[PDB]
Design a protein around this ligand. Structure first.
Ligand SMILES: Nc1ncnc2c1ncn2[C@@H]1O[C@@H](COP(=O)(O)OC(=O)[C@H](N)CCCCNC(=O)OC[C@H]2C[C@H]3C=C[C@@H]2C3)[C@H](O)[C@H]1O
Ligand SMILES: Nc1ncnc2c1ncn2[C@@H]1O[C@@H](COP(=O)(O)OC(=O)[C@H](N)CCCCNC(=O)OC[C@H]2C[C@H]3C=C[C@@H]2C3)[C@H](O)[C@H]1O
Ligand SMILES: [Mg+2]
Ligand SMILES: [Mg+2]
Lengths: 260, 260
């Protein structure tokens, strides 16, 4: 029984699921271990195809949407491709900034939802009663400096409230109800600025305004907001070792390798 | 009563809804006509905020998802940002091609869902029983040559079946059930290649394979597929004059101007 090589164990870890109950220094050749795990992963995909058929990331988006709509928040779908000026406007200059995917001279793939939400807040203040509550869920793009927990293409939820009720207590209560509903453990810290943590993993950054650069979006009321990464939430919900398993991918479906 | 100017009537058309019942050469000054329409549009947004709260485009995606999942199709969420090579692979060369948003030397914003679906078809053939049925819904990107009915940022549905049952009759039956479920009138033409039309407006292009370039994706079985634009479907469902009203936008919410 030769020990598994490092590339072999890497291969097996692609096919490994958290609830497998299989330790890999146990006698059997690579080929049998591989063959066992393929068989199981095929079965996993067959079950999904026979019974559920929903993608985890689409499903989560829909669960989150239902949660915020039911709690009085308006669902936004704004452009993914935005003007660079909105980023400049957000404090940043062309010298953080090497993380943006530029598309054209004036355009980039949004790295955040906050700018478009700001515009929606300003415009809806003319139409809607206090408080104004809104959220968006969708793709954001950042070129990685880390990549251990970081994706270049990810999916954020960002919710906002403007006008009355915009306190820390209220912001914590929304966050708390929200993660309790999803069944994800968390603690709230701060880096008012708050961070919502699952062990060493950041689920969300959150803010209670006002912030000085509010006036750049025509915002002059109290507000509170928070952004969450859906793939981070999945990683924790499904106990994935690597966040790549939670992403838009051609290599994983609902965390199951597609290279079988 | 001076006639309305062209810019004034343009302004009023932004605030106009299909079911308004208001003709604009009728005596009253611009300012009263404008003021009337603002009042109505504010009310419209208040009702949405008080009662529904769902975005039309998110809502449609969810309705379509439910329809295909229930009919045996697996929900895909694949990368939006893809390699240029997948486009080259799709027949095209660097000399159609001025329509692609390049991001980097090797990457672009996908103009279609078909390539990623092809990879999913090949990989799942090793795991799933015949027939294999899948779909994706999500953003696609094309630089416009027209723009009357064309958005740069749009949302496509693309479904596929591979193996058995991949006939024209079957493809028409799926399309037919699908649009009847949504309540959208259509006829099926062809430009086998099929086009699904609402008057002069293309809702979908559809294909019954095999096609010769199938082998470039490792596909050697019978297949059928169809792509639909969600914003085109909304334009027709809600009787919008301009498809911009159906898009991801900071200027319209569920077809209602946000510049109030
Ligand atoms: N690469 C990645 N891979 C995976 N997940 C990632 C990745 N990168 C981030 N994440 C995930 O997403 C991260 C959240 O993103 P950030 O922490 O980077 O924070 C923000 O950017 C928001 N601006 C915070 C919003 C705070 C409230 N702001 C706000 O509400 O805007 C207010 C606006 C309305 C008007 C008033 C003022 C303005 C205008 C999660 O931690 C991580 O899970
Ligand atoms: N700019 C726009 N603005 C608004 N709506 C738009 C816009 N542009 C398009 N639309 C909307 O979207 C359009 C549909 O897009 P196209 O007509 O441009 O057609 C396709 O591209 C698909 N390849 C057809 C898929 C055909 C089946 N192929 C397929 O299934 O792929 C098979 C793959 C699996 C493997 C086997 C072979 C390969 C690999 C609607 O007409 C319009 O409403
Ligand atoms: Mg942060
Ligand atoms: Mg076409």
């Amino acid at each position: 029984a030769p020990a598994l090589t490092k590339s072999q164990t890497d291969r097996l870890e692609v096919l490994l699921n958290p609830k497998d109950e299989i330790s890999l220094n146990s006698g059997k050749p690579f080929r049998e271990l591989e063959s066992e795990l393929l068989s199981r992963r095929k079965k996993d995909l067959q079950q999904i195809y026979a019974e559920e058929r929903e993608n985890y990331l689409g499903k989560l988006e829909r669960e989150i949407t239902r949660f915020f709509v039911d709690r009085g928040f308006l669902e936004i779908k704004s452009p993914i491709l935005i003007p660079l000026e909105y980023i400049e406007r957000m404090g940043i200059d062309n010298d953080l900034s090497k993380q943006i995917f530029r598309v054209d001279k004036n355009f980039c793939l949004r790295p955040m939802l906050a700018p478009n939400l700001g515009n929606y807040l300003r415009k809806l203040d003319r139409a809607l009663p206090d408080p104004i509550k809104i959220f968006e869920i969708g793709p954001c793009y950042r070129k990685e400096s880390d990549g251990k927990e970081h994706l270049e293409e990810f999916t954020m939820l960002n919710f906002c409230q403007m006008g009355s009720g915009c306190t820390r207590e209220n912001l914590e209560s929304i966050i708390t109800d929200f993660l309790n509903h999803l069944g994800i453990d968390f603690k709230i810290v701060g880096d008012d600025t708050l961070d919502v943590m699952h062990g060493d993993l950041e689920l969300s950054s959150a803010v209670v305004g006002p912030r000085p650069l509010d006036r750049e979006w025509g915002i002059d009321k109290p507000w509170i907001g928070a952004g969450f990464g859906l793939e981070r939430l999945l990683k924790v919900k499904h106990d994935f070792k690597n966040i790549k398993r939670a992403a838009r991918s051609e290599s994983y479906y609902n965390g199951i390798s597609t290279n079988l």
